[PDB]
Amino acid sequence: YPIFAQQNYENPREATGRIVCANCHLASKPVDIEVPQAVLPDTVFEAVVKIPYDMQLKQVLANGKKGALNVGAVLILPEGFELAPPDRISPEMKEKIGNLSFQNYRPNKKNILVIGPVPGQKYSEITFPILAPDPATNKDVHFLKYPIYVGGNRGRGQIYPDGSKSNNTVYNATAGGIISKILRKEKGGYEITIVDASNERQVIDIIPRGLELLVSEGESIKLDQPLTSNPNVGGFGQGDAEIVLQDPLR
Amino acid sequence: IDVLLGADDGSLAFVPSEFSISPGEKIVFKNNAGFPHNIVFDEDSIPSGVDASKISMSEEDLLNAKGETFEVALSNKGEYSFYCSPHQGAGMVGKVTVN
Numbered sequence: 001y002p003i004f005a006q007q008n009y010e011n012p013r014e015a016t017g018r019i020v021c022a023n024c025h026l027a028s029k030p031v032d033i034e035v036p037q038a039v040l041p042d043t044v045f046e047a048v049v050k051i052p053y054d055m056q057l058k059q060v061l062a063n064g065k066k067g068a069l070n071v072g073a074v075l076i077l078p079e080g081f082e083l084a085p086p087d088r089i090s091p092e093m094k095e096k097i098g099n100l101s102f103q104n105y106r107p108n109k110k111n112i113l114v115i116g117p118v119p120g121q122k123y124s125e126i127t128f129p130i131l132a133p134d135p136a137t138n139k140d141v142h143f144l145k146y147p148i149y150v151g152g153n154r155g156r157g158q159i160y161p162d163g164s165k166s167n168n169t170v171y172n173a174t175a176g177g178i179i180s181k182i183l184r185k186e187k188g189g190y191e192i193t194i195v196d197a198s199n200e201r202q203v204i205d206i207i208p209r210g211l212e213l214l215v216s217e218g219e220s221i222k223l224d225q226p227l228t229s230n231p232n233v234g235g236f237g238q239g240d241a242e243i244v245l246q247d248p249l250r
Numbered sequence: 251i252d253v254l255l256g257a258d259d260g261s262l263a264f265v266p267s268e269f270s271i272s273p274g275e276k277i278v279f280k281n282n283a284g285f286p287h288n289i290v291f292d293e294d295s296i297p298s299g300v301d302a303s304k305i306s307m308s309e310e311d312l313l314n315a316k317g318e319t320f321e322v323a324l325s326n327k328g329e330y331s332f333y334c335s336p337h338q339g340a341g342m343v344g345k346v347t348v349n
């Protein structure tokens with residue numbers, strides 16, 4: 001979620017250029033962003049982000065059941081640019097943004113906006129109302145070409161903020177050997193007993209519900225060999241745009 | 251016992267998240283911050299024979315206003331793992347022990 005990155009990452013873009021959602025959102029999927037080639041000082045413009053995915057896809061929800069995906073995004077604007085105020089947003093644009101609440105990554109970062117989780121069926125494309133700054137009223141803002149970075153995600157992530165894996169990822173064998181027993185649990189989930197004949201050790205790997213096994217009893221498994229299918233149908237992607245803060249003269 | 255859904259600083263967590271109660275004692279989960287929220291008991295992580303539908307909200311049900319509460323009384327002894335369906339990945343999880 002956009003709150004996990006905000007809660008323990010002061011800046012959402014790392015030195016490699018990767019947005020911090022890719023640390024838990026491990027599948028890569030395309031994100032698009034359309035921005036006007038140039039904008040004038042103190043004018044509202046729209047940054048439309050597209051997080052496309054096949055909508056007949058059903059992901060594994062946190063309780064094993066399958067459901068639809070939710071979308072979320074982080075927009076990194078240049079310093080001076082910020083969310084347009086409600087009095088400056090047109091009525092033809094207010095119906096376009098639906099009723100989304102864009103939050104600041106942090107109260108001091110007014111140029112980084114986050115939104116989500118919001119339902120993917122309704123918000124695969126999101127419109128961010130941005131207000132262009134004015135160089136005559138801001139000495140660090142100039143008429144220049146500015147970079148815009150966006151991070152778009154659809155579907156549940158694989159790792160939580162404590163390092164724990166979710167049930168929306170592959171479960172690998174913690175030991176090599178032969179599966180001597182597979183206990184199918186009453187309310188869903190499995191208990192796999194692996195006899196590591198090489199180390200004379202017995203280990204039990206537990207698999208959560210919503211995942212189907214790829215192994216049978218008596219099969220030889222290697223360390224880190226995938227014991228279940230990959231139930232992730234979502235993914236994170238990033239894109240960038242260039243906007244020209246234009247002088248109203250020439 | 252009263253448990254807040256969302257900390258006073260807007261953190262996505264149950265306060266408290268780990269606690270013990272006597273059998274028949276009521277737990278009042280109240281919407282505090284970061285809602286909507288809901289309380290779902292893990293059917294595979296509660297005492298054997300307990301019906302999770304009798305002590306949890308539906309995964310599709312939500313408390314979306316400040317002050318909304320969900321109350322439940324547990325009688326069977328053992329450990330009960332619960333979580334918020336939309337914020338389970340955030341770490342909004344908890345465990346109650348009926349002793």
Ligand code: HEC
Binds near residue numbers: 006022068074
């Ligand atoms: C690890 C600390 C994470 C970071 C950083 C980000 N996300 Fe995340 N996200 C993560 C998990 C484990 C989950 C699943 C929670 C659950 O139990 O369901 C999520 C979920 C989302 C969702 C909702 C998916 C859905 O319900 O279908 C979205 C929209 C999402 N995350 C977006 C997102 C963005 C854009 C982030 C960067 C700012 C981001 N997440 C960071 C784990 C982590």
Ligand SMILES: [Cu+2]
Binds near residue numbers: 262288335336342
């Ligand atoms: Cu919650």
